[PDB]
């Protein structure tokens, strides 16, 4: 009744949320990324914008989260706040209009082990070339580019948690099909930063226009 | 300059009930967890449970209903209870000053521990 | 739990040998493998923990060594101090304890 009170106090007494989740600074964080898509919102073609409805899992191990279960009544997982951990810094590169990481902070689920899983919802705008040419018949490409923003390959790795998005609870668009999903990962130098390439996952969807509305009213 | 002494019975009856002393010097109970590890005869050390700094307690899933621990922070003394005594209990009790890393314990000093032997 | 193992169950070597007791787990101890030094009616004295972290106080002639689920003591040169049973323990998972190494001078 006291025992997970008395776990989080532990925990968190000397934590940093500013250094790496790591034993030895030389050690790369390995983070695992799974972008669930639940619902695509939106496909602006005129502003060339897609919103969409993600939940962009990632898990990691967190060296000094362990704790021993027998020392809490064999307590194996705990709910804390997001904010009071080291947390990826995720973002969208190809944003068009919204906000580049995670702002909802939910709670992280923090296991014995130092596992982390970290589930946080997002709308992301991303930019996508509406590609006009077979409209209304057209099958249109759009793709998140998500990657730590600061943290680079050899510092913090990015793995995906499967080669496709999760799709298990995606909503049916009235409009568009998702034909085809893919994760790939890169590792890309940018002219900021010469000597150090930064990895992200590239997700894309193979959305196919459903015609019959622009048929009836149009065509 | 760090100590530890348990105290008790050398001898207690079957299913009478065991009390341990833990005598503390050197530190500050208010500071240091103090874990109880007993060996039964024949057999590798085996965790009880730990007094808390802050006061709580945890036990040994296999002794929790057995084992009560308290401690009185003035005399520096922690001290164990178990009841239902059994010819088992027979062996060697510790308590242990525990370290820690974060949320991680360990048994940094042993007292010099003493022989229970449970028998009619 | 995790399971331990330690052999040999009892050792002889002569003042000044090196020795290399070994404890295996049945589980990843992930390093949180602890080494303590018991003598007959005398308190337990912890030599190493997190595998090679020396307990102040300790002789430097005892290191650790090891990764997984297979760990080592080393005495670089065994003293007639050094005789005794040593444990193994670990403490990542619960609480268990190696059945113990009596360390005995040759004969």
């Known amino acids: 009744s006291e025992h997970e009170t008395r776990l989080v106090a532990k925990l968190f007494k000397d934590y940093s949320s500013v250094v790496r989740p790591v034993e030895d600074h030389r050690q790369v964080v390995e983070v695992t990324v799974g972008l669930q898509l639940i619902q695509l919102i939106n496909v602006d073609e005129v502003n060339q914008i897609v919103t969409t409805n993600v939940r962009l899992k990632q898990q990691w191990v967190d060296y000094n989260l362990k704790w021993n279960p027998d020392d809490y009544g064999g307590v194996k997982k705990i709910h804390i706040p997001s904010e009071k951990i080291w947390r990826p810094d995720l973002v969208l590169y190809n944003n068009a209009d919204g906000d580049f990481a995670i702002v909802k902070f939910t709670k992280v689920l923090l296991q014995y082990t130092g596992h982390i899983t970290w589930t946080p919802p997002a709308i992301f705008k991303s930019y996508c070339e509406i590609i006009v040419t077979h409209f209304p018949f057209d099958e249109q490409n759009c793709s998140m580019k998500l990657g730590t923003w600061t943290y680079d390959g050899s510092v913090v790795a990015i793995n995906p948690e499967s080669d496709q998005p999760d799709l298990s609870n995606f909503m049916e668009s009235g409009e568009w099909v998702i034909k085809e999903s893919r994760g790939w990962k890169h590792s890309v130098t940018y002219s900021c930063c010469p000597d150090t390439p930064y990895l992200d996952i590239t997700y894309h969807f193979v959305m196919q226009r459903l015609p019959l509305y622009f048929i009836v009213n149009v065509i | 300059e760090v100590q530890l002494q348990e105290s008790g019975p050398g001898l207690v009856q079957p299913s009478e009930t065991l009390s341990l002393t833990c005598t503390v010097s050197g530190f500050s109970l208010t500071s240091y967890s103090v874990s109880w590890l007993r060996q039964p005869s024949g057999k590798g050390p085996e965790w009880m449970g730990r007094?808390?700094?802050?006061?709580?307690?945890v036990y040994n899933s296999g002794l929790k209903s057995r084992l009560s621990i308290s401690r009185d922070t003035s005399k520096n003394q922690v001290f164990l209870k178990m009841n239902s005594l059994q010819t088992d209990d027979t062996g060697t009790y510790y308590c242990?000053?525990?370290?820690?890393?974060?949320?991680?314990?360990?048994?940094?000093?042993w007292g010099q521990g003493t022989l229970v032997t449970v028998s009619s | 739990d995790i399971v331990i193992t330690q052999s040999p169950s009892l050792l002889s070597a002569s003042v000044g040998d090196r020795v290399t007791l070994t404890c295996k787990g049945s589980q990843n101890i992930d390093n949180y493998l602890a080494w303590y030094q018991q003598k007959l009616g005398e308190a337990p004295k912890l030599l190493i923990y997190?595998?090679?972290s020396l307990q102040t106080g300790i002789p430097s002639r005892f290191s650790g060594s090891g990764s997984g689920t297979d760990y080592t003591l080393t005495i670089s040169s065994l003293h007639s101090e050094d005789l005794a049973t040593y444990y193994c323990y670990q403490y990542i998972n619960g609480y268990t304890f190696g059945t113990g190494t009596k360390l005995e001078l040759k004969r």
């Open positions: 242990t000053r525990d370290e820690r890393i974060r949320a991680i314990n360990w048994f940094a000093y």
């Open positions: 007094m808390w700094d802050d006061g709580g307690t």
């Open positions: 997190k595998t090679n």
